[PDB]
Structures are given as C-alpha cells and as structure tokens.
Design an enzyme around this catalytic site. Sequence first.
Site, mmCIF file in Angstrom:
data_model
loop_
_atom_site.group_PDB
_atom_site.id
_atom_site.type_symbol
_atom_site.label_atom_id
_atom_site.label_comp_id
_atom_site.label_asym_id
_atom_site.label_seq_id
_atom_site.Cartn_x
_atom_site.Cartn_y
_atom_site.Cartn_z
ATOM 1 N N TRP A 72 1.719 -6.705 -32.807
ATOM 2 C CA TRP A 72 2.521 -6.576 -34.026
ATOM 3 C C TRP A 72 2.199 -5.279 -34.764
ATOM 4 C CZ3 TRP A 72 -0.566 -11.411 -34.914
ATOM 5 C CH2 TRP A 72 0.025 -12.526 -34.305
ATOM 6 N N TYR A 78 -4.433 -9.916 -28.978
ATOM 7 C CA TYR A 78 -4.143 -11.342 -28.847
ATOM 8 C C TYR A 78 -3.743 -11.675 -27.422
ATOM 9 C CZ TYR A 78 -3.857 -12.553 -33.833
ATOM 10 O OH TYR A 78 -4.116 -12.803 -35.158
ATOM 11 N N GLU A 111 -15.807 -9.770 -36.540
ATOM 12 C CA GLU A 111 -14.731 -10.012 -37.492
ATOM 13 C C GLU A 111 -15.225 -10.631 -38.782
ATOM 14 O OE1 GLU A 111 -10.842 -11.550 -36.064
ATOM 15 O OE2 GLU A 111 -10.764 -12.722 -37.908
ATOM 16 N N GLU A 137 -12.172 -16.137 -30.791
ATOM 17 C CA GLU A 137 -12.522 -17.369 -31.521
ATOM 18 C C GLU A 137 -12.198 -18.706 -30.847
ATOM 19 O OE1 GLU A 137 -10.977 -17.300 -35.522
ATOM 20 O OE2 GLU A 137 -11.899 -15.348 -35.898
#
Length: 298
Positions: free
Chosen positions: A36, A63, A224, A136
């Site tokens: 994105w 991602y 992160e 994650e």
Amino acid sequence: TPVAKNGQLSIKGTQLVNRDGKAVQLKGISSHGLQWYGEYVNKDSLKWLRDDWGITVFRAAMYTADGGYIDNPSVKNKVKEAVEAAKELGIYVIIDWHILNDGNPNQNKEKAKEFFKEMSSLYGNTPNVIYEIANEPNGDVNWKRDIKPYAEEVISVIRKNDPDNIIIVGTGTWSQDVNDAADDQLKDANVMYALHFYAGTHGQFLRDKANYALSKGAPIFVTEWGTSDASGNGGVFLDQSREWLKYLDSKTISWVNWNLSDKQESSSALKPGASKTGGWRLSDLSASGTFVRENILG
C-alpha cells in the site's frame, strides 16, 4: 556511516555487537505494508531519513496476507529496492516477512522458505541485512508447537546462503511472548527474538517478560513499536513512549518505530500530503513523527 563503521553484526550474549565486538543500538523506522505504501520507500526518502534523522536501520514491511506477497509477489521488488538503497547508503535493512492475518507462520511456510532462499542468496554476502522471518504470530499459535519449528526450517534455508547475518524471530501474541521463546531457545548463534509494544496499550507487564527473557540469555530486538495504541491510534502517548525508550536504552535494545507513511492514524510519522521522497518540512511531520526524529537525533 554505520556498517562502514560497524561492519557485520553478531550477538555477544544478549548484546548486539559490531565487528569489533562493540555494543551497538540501531534506531530507525518501518515502512507500512509495502503493497500500500511502498511509494514512500525509496533511496531518496531513505537518504533523507539517514541524513536528517540519523536512522541506522530501515525495516521493509512486506505483508504476506492482506493483498501482500502471497497474492501479489511483485512487491518483492520493493524489498529489493530498499535493500539496494540500504547497501548504497550504509544503513542496515530488515527484510520483514510480515505475517499478521495469517497468524500462524506455518500457513505460508513453503512460500516463506522460497522467499528467504532468494533473499539470502541475493544479499547474504551483504553486511546490511537482517532477516525478520515472522512479524507477529497470533491466535492459537505458540512457541513450542508452531513458531519454533517454523524458525528452524526457515533458519536452515537462510544459513545455507548466509551463515552469520542476524535473524530475528517473532514470538507469540503479536511478538509479546518472548518468555516462552526464552525458555525453549534456538541454537543459532545469531538469532534474536522480536518484542513489539505500543505505548498506548502496553506497560510494565510486557517489560517484565522482556526482563525474564534477557535473564535467561535470549537477545531481544524491537522490530516494531509505536507511540500510539496497538490499533495504531489513540493519539501520541508521550509519557509511556518516553518511559519505554528509557527502558530500551538501559539495555541497549535496538528499535524500529511504526510507521513511515502518511496514513490517517496516530502511529504515522507523516501528515497526509507529505512527499514520498523526503525533504519534509518540520510541519509535514506528525506529533508521532516529530517525537521519533527527536529521539534518534539523540
């Protein structure tokens, strides 16, 4: 510039060290999902961050799910772009196989292994590179059953092409459950475990698991963290954020803030409309962005 100054990183006990064996604490920022917001990830903006912010590491958040690499692999080109920029700029770069909705890292393990075979192959003679193999883990997903076995296979395919660059492995409950990792550690000499926090959500309890992990010998890397809450909102939480960074400094823990984009959420470094190639005015930065930059410029 680092890497020119620190060379190739390795782990001494818990402490990330440079080729001299010096302690090193990397500080930087992560892209948002590259599918994105890869438009913000280029040699210009990375250069600007290096020159204006003093970043020493950039994270490329690829991602897998949610319109990412599984459905559109051409995004790997954005990883390669960022990596070439990082090599050309003398900063470290994290290749982040950014699982999230695919909360079990096993879901995409075959594609992950193939992905990492190519990257370790392309870049494994490169001191810039850090591999982050599973952003994650979350859901009914734990260390012993799910995350450890994945890491051994993926690690085994990276070490073939790249025996010594740092590999960072995510942990359970959105890279909180480092204690479970800390008990059943891997054997790889250059593995670290990811810890993620948000200042608006996470507090002392998360720090204690971290303390527990270090005390058992498991190195930690904050691949992160955000000044917002875990959703990536709630405004910009300065007391807890200051409080977290104080804690991280105290143990020389490297960190990477989420996130470099002009997305309409509190965690964004940039105000909507901010240039994709840097050269940002001080006003172009968000409340979050300003704080993060101030905390890297020392």
